[PDB]
Amino acid sequence: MDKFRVQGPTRLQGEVTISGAKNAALPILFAALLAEEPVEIQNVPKLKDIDTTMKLLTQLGTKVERXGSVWIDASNVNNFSAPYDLVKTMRASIWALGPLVARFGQGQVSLPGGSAIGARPVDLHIFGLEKLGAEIKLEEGYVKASVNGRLKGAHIVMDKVSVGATVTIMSAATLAEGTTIIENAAREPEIVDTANFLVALGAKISGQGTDRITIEGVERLGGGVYRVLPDRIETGTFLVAAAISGGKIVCRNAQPDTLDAVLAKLREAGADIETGEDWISLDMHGKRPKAVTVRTAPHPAFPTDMQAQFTLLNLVAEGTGVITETIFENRFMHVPELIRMGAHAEIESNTVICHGVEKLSGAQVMATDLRASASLVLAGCIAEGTTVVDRIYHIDRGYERIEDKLRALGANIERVKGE
Amino acid sequence: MDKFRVQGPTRLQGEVTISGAKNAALPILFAALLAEEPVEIQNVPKLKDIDTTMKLLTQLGTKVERXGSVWIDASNVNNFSAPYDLVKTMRASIWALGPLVARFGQGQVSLPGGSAIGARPVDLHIFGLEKLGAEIKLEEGYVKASVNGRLKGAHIVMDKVSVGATVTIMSAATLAEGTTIIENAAREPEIVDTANFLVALGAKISGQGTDRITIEGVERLGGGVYRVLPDRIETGTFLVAAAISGGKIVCRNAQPDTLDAVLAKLREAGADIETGEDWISLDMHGKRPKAVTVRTAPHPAFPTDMQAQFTLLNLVAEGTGVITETIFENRFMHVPELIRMGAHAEIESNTVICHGVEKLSGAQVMATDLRASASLVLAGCIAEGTTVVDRIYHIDRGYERIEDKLRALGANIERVKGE
Amino acid sequence: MDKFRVQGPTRLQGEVTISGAKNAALPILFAALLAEEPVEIQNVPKLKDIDTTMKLLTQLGTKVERXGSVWIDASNVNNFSAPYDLVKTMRASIWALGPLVARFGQGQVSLPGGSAIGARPVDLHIFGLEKLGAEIKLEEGYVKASVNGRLKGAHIVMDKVSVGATVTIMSAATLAEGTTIIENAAREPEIVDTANFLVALGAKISGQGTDRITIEGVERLGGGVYRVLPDRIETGTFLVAAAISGGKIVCRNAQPDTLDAVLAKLREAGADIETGEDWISLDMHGKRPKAVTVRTAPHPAFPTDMQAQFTLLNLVAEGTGVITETIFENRFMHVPELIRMGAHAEIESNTVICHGVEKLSGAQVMATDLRASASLVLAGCIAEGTTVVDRIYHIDRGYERIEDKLRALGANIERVKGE
Amino acid sequence: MDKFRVQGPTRLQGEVTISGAKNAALPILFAALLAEEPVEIQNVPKLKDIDTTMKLLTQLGTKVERXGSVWIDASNVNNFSAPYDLVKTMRASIWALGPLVARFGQGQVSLPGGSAIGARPVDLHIFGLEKLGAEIKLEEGYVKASVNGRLKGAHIVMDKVSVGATVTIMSAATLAEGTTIIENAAREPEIVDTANFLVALGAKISGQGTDRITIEGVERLGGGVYRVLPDRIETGTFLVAAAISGGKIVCRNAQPDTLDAVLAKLREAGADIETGEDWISLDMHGKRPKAVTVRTAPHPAFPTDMQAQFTLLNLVAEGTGVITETIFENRFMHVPELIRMGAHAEIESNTVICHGVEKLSGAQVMATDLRASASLVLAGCIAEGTTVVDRIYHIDRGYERIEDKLRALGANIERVKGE
Numbered sequence A, B, C, D: 001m002d003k004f005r006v007q008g009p010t011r012l013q014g015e016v017t018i019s020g021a022k023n024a025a026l027p028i029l030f031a032a033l034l035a036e037e038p039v040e041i042q043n044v045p046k047l048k049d050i051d052t053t054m055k056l057l058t059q060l061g062t063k064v065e066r067x068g069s070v071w072i073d074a075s076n077v078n079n080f081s082a083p084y085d086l087v088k089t090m091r092a093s094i095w096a097l098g099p100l101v102a103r104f105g106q107g108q109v110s111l112p113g114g115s116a117i118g119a120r121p122v123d124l125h126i127f128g129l130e131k132l133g134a135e136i137k138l139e140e141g142y143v144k145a146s147v148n149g150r151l152k153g154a155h156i157v158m159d160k161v162s163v164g165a166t167v168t169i170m171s172a173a174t175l176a177e178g179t180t181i182i183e184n185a186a187r188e189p190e191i192v193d194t195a196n197f198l199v200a201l202g203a204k205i206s207g208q209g210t211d212r213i214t215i216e217g218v219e220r221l222g223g224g225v226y227r228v229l230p231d232r233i234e235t236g237t238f239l240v241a242a243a244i245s246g247g248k249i250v251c252r253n254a255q256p257d258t259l260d261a262v263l264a265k266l267r268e269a270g271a272d273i274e275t276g277e278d279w280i281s282l283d284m285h286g287k288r289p290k291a292v293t294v295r296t297a298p299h300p301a302f303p304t305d306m307q308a309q310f311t312l313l314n315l316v317a318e319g320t321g322v323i324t325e326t327i328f329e330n331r332f333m334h335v336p337e338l339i340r341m342g343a344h345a346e347i348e349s350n351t352v353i354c355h356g357v358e359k360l361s362g363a364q365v366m367a368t369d370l371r372a373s374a375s376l377v378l379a380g381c382i383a384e385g386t387t388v389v390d391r392i393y394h395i396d397r398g399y400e401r402i403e404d405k406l407r408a409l410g411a412n413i414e415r416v417k418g419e
């Protein structure tokens, strides 16, 4: 069991080049199951979930290889199932269902169980596919979708704003018979990116980025080349790294308009921010951050994927900060760990009341989930002494060589084994 | 203290002509304060809040008169305060602050207190105005806004989706210097309608209806004519009226695209729905409704203003219905009253678990707020016997002579005094 | 519509003699319906609810008269129903059901509708009576109970801790055949007082004050004399009055052991407290209170009836105070009103985050419920200038001559009309 | 990674002998650190946490050994710290802090991090120890307690009911100077058992079992023998086993009065229950269970440790069952897993709405915590086909060879490896 040994404090400054978005690459890779012709996806980060995805696709009969790009040839998909073994390691596997039933009339994916940050049901994915004409049956833990011929467009109103269900329904609808409308669709940048990818293959989609998406089905989708957009969560993570360590940083290969909420909050924390077409610079001028109030919600509001990072920022900020999480019911696992490092906080239902302290103390902590692990590593960077973050494999799920990029910013970090 | 005597059951059927939206006419009436020339607002419903608004505007030195339209001449606005006496009867008065400070550099409005359905703070309106350059102070219960010269455009990210704050900021921004961007803005049809009204006066606005509104300030706004859009909640209320009484109805002067969530839910309840350019028909074919699941949220999701009405529908429906209110913290006051009529429900935090019964029993109940009073009246129409709904003055706030429109559908309803 | 016009600031100091507990007097007065012989209840406060109760009792055929005591003669009961008109003014009327069905085999009470501070169902009262053998029906909004002969003892486990339901079940059980056991009973001081009252009439009760109450039914209860214990909420209210005005007070005719949580919280706020056998003294030594954290819960935890008062204390205290209400879902109505007076707070689900300020500003505010009204009045006492608390009739429901007692502490208060 | 392969459906019937309470043995074993003379604890179950506890004690310089009993000689404790590597595997280790600082004036325990079912802070333990005079510092993740001389009795009011904090405070108070009073103490049967154990060593404690515990400190505690009470949760687990499989079972070595809430709920589910002095019999007479409503809360209310089990019972019961969890914020992890087996449920905040189905389908599921793992195993016993419960090491924490006991009841179970 790998761990990260961090010695602080250290001001983090310099530059970092943002990788392609984990959450755009994933839905795109699955959307590729719709392509009857070779597809090249560019700027795909090297993450654990990308590997698991390539594995799942290959197991479906797809020809896959990668480097900076991932080349896909799904012309001969001949297997339509995602076994429990793979699904249990990556719930995103659920995104295989829509494309498979939409193009081949069938698909079986193991129903994901519970997740670290919440129950995370997939009822909206199922609801959507059923509205498109698919028949869904659950047997032996497998959601089994089927349709005789082509799915049929339908006007669907979402009971909840869901990034995942939006991707599933929008993706399957591209090969449906007629027009599909997704009312109360997720507006996240990754939805836009996945939509534009599908359109690149020959799909007809409009409204991506708004509350209502309109898809006009076609008989088939071809191939092509598409470059994934910048990872806004990675970008925010590094901006937070500078913001909490009195440093300065410039993020290259970034897309500023995907982060208005985060940037505005960073400015309120006292950060001096400047943005360009493809870059963002943040300078704390050696100042300690000011406490801010945050409420997560669907894009363009403050993103839940930056919540643990801002929880850390408030814990070392001057003043009382309040963090309200409205997306996932169990996403405060980093709090108890930060408390071990000397932080002061109280959890009241889905809100964390933070009382910032001058400095944290190095201690042994445990990563419980992707964003939580990144926060613990950042905490280790600014804490006094040695911090050992156990189970950092979590971090390898959504950050490409975070270790090197942090070191390049002045961090004293070492990856160690010792199970 | 007026009351409503309703005798049932009665299958409600026929037609109704939807009035102009209460929640579009109000923000527009206040936005009119920005007009330097005569303005005519058409299709304005005759509601208690419209009367209070006319008095408030008059008290600001505005010349006001009405019938179907409301004619406004705010060329000579010479007073800039909204007193506690008026604000305490209508919190919407808060909408006078932005236009006043934007056009005259000053404005004072009594800070609204607690509301029946929630604390409903206005911190976001104040925040927005401050971001536009206004200096805000609270003294003696009055929020006093001021700015030296014109307000200045700014990029504002909303910590919460707010219909009211969106109106305040968007309205004030039309006269600000430069460009204003509202990130995570409310998307309600009434926001769209208010934006279009401001545009008709000469304002420059785009993005209304999406989560990002862009306003380019101008030196001043003129006058003109604008017709308020159909009231979607009144429409939904009457559609429910037929849906729960096994009836049929046709709503005239309606705008179907403002009710996708509501219509979708009525179909799930078993309703046969048809829509035209400006009309909506619903036929229950004598059926008892089927229990549905609802979760209120910002437009285009299911609206909180239809929540009590659907709570009623589920309480007389087949099966177990679940209603989750995420907008207001005290909007279940109709439940205890419906329970007095034989309904079976349990409140669990912000969710109501409903167990539909065949028929309700007439009983004496108390209206506590606008939408709940409408639900109790509808309940009276379908319950067995006589139902007396006390304090129906609440209903005259958002419905234009509802007993008449209901009587034309076959309701045995009478307005009595007896304090 | 009476109001309290209060001039501040004024330090509150001196002495106050605590009246009998409103919440002990009420359940005992209803318990008296079980008495076949004359009963005298001493130390009964003069409150609106006592008058409504004496009114309801008289209406049942009981002979009632009062002064310091209330003399009851229920040897004859010629009517067994509590009308809607009365119940609507006092939900506590529900307590007439149990004694009536237990002694006469019949009784009916109008099902209470919604309450200002919550839905407050009475399902547990009904459940308990049904477990004791009563048949319950709901017709025309009335709860109708009946039993052929005597009720029979049962082992009942309460799904939730309820003061009211514990009173109903314990009271009815006294005339039941056999032994009754109430598991997970409320342990409030008033339950202990009502049990001791019943025992004085000849009932056999043990465990009152613990989570399991054992009642041994007897054929009939006689008469007697019983003194109601001191009102702990009135006591806490006056202690807070001193704590938030830098004052020093001595509460006479008090019972310290019923207020451990409150006293401990006041000490944490910086109050110097001393207690005797029947008195409590509190001295703030001119200090501003220190913010505290509070979580309401069943006795002996911090009581929800002191929640609004402590919210006020935190809003004028030094630091960040947190109030969490777990009993009633709508008991923060005082917050929006205090905010009108310059307080700073945010409500997050069932928790209020307070940011204490130096001085409040006098303003026009509205009382919404009993404890809230008392808090607004205290706020007026320490605020700068003139505060007008509308609808103070709410305060006359549970405070005997609060105006006089406050004036005797130095308050500049005046009860004015002017509707 | 061990797993359980279960084959269903198999009716569970027969007998089981209840082991000593896991949650009584643990606090007692730590309380033993106060004993200056040899102690023998009887009826201690063989569980993972007991082993970890013996390791921790041993490492403090304690002489420990076991079989049915555990013999402790803590006369020579020479080390006062519980390392991170031990506490990370068992947060109950926190219970070493109080005894150590109370008897030796010092002690340091690694502050526990996050837990599977919630953040579970220990702020109340620290608060209590500080009130007893201990100085608490946090450094490098270790909570360091110290006091010069002996702790001093104090009147402590818990602003939340905590089993753990109650144990910590009550344990340390036994050696304190003077009288300590714990207001709003936990009333769990294990608190009673731990208090009687301390009393057996020479401590002076009264009130155990009520919301107020009084402890009179003494100079030192001797040795002795004490038998741990029956495990009510294990008992409840096996009673549910029979109740959901239409079986009949008898639990030996049980203590009925510790399960009033659970038995009452089982009867409501249709179970025929009889109890003796030390046994409990439950017969379902081949009937399918009836859906019940549950709300966890401090003893004697329904226990949170039986919540997952009852979630299961409702998922295979007739009707709609509602489970509300008020103790831990993340204890619904079993729901997603049961859903994979064909169950129908929706999670609404802290409530689960269940829609019972006839039969579950065997599938691969994952144990997430102790009670959840037991629930999944039981589900496997009644499900149709093969069920594989991964990570059953969780079950070995609180159940002594559950495999054998279930098999003795007719279950087709087998522990397999295969990582």
Ligand SMILES: C=C(O[C@H]1[C@H](O)[C@@H](CO)O[C@H](OP(=O)(O)OP(=O)(O)OC[C@H]2O[C@@H](n3ccc(=O)[nH]c3=O)[C@H](O)[C@@H]2O)[C@@H]1NC(C)=O)C(=O)O
Residues within 6 Å of the ligand: A022, A023, A024, A026, A092, A118, A119, A120, A121, A122, A123, A124, A125, A126, A160, A161, A162, A163, A164, A165, A186, A303, A304, A305, A327, A328, A329, A370, A371, A398
């Ligand atoms: C957790 C991460 O990323 C997450 C990110 O937090 C969320 C929210 O923006 O959207 C993606 O998941 P997701 O698709 O499961 O998110 P959502 O579907 O939007 O879930 C939002 C809310 O809806 C609920 N939900 C979702 C689907 C459904 O059928 N039913 C349902 O009730 C969720 O359980 C939650 O209560 C990202 N993952 C990918 C692979 O695209 C991370 O990388 O750190």
Ligand SMILES: C=C(O[C@H]1[C@H](O)[C@@H](CO)O[C@H](OP(=O)(O)OP(=O)(O)OC[C@H]2O[C@@H](n3ccc(=O)[nH]c3=O)[C@H](O)[C@@H]2O)[C@@H]1NC(C)=O)C(=O)O
Residues within 6 Å of the ligand: B022, B023, B024, B026, B092, B118, B119, B120, B121, B122, B123, B124, B125, B126, B160, B161, B162, B163, B164, B165, B186, B303, B304, B305, B327, B328, B329, B370, B371, B398
């Ligand atoms: C209640 C009615 O209508 C309401 C309707 O329910 C709501 C929601 O769609 O939007 C209008 O009020 P509103 O402007 O106060 O609504 P919002 O601002 O959107 O409030 C939404 C949520 O944000 C909160 N909120 C709002 C403003 C602010 O500064 N801060 C804040 O925290 C609210 O208290 C609530 O928790 C309608 N009223 C008018 C006059 O336009 C009705 O007619 O029955």
Ligand SMILES: C=C(O[C@H]1[C@H](O)[C@@H](CO)O[C@H](OP(=O)(O)OP(=O)(O)OC[C@H]2O[C@@H](n3ccc(=O)[nH]c3=O)[C@H](O)[C@@H]2O)[C@@H]1NC(C)=O)C(=O)O
Residues within 6 Å of the ligand: C022, C023, C024, C026, C092, C118, C119, C120, C121, C122, C123, C124, C125, C126, C160, C161, C162, C163, C164, C165, C186, C188, C303, C304, C305, C327, C328, C329, C370, C371, C398
């Ligand atoms: C509100 C006041 O006093 C109240 C005090 O707050 C509460 C709590 O201690 O106990 C008395 O009411 P109560 O009898 O209605 O209180 P409870 O029954 O204990 O209610 C507690 C919780 O249980 C719920 N509840 C109660 C009864 C029932 O059948 N079902 C149920 O769900 C409540 O709605 C609430 O969510 C006092 N009133 C009298 C007349 O004795 C006041 O005087 O200011």
Ligand SMILES: C=C(O[C@H]1[C@H](O)[C@@H](CO)O[C@H](OP(=O)(O)OP(=O)(O)OC[C@H]2O[C@@H](n3ccc(=O)[nH]c3=O)[C@H](O)[C@@H]2O)[C@@H]1NC(C)=O)C(=O)O
Residues within 6 Å of the ligand: D022, D023, D024, D026, D092, D118, D119, D120, D121, D122, D123, D124, D125, D126, D160, D161, D162, D163, D164, D165, D186, D188, D303, D304, D305, D327, D328, D329, D370, D371, D398
């Ligand atoms: C989880 C198990 O058992 C648990 C059982 O659920 C709970 C509740 O009855 O009481 C014991 O834990 P515990 O001591 O941590 O329980 P509690 O202290 O009572 O916690 C109750 C509530 O108070 C909170 N809490 C507790 C202590 C504190 O200092 N602060 C605090 O906020 C908790 O996080 C929770 O929100 C049992 N464990 C042992 C080893 O005795 C199990 O065996 O499955």
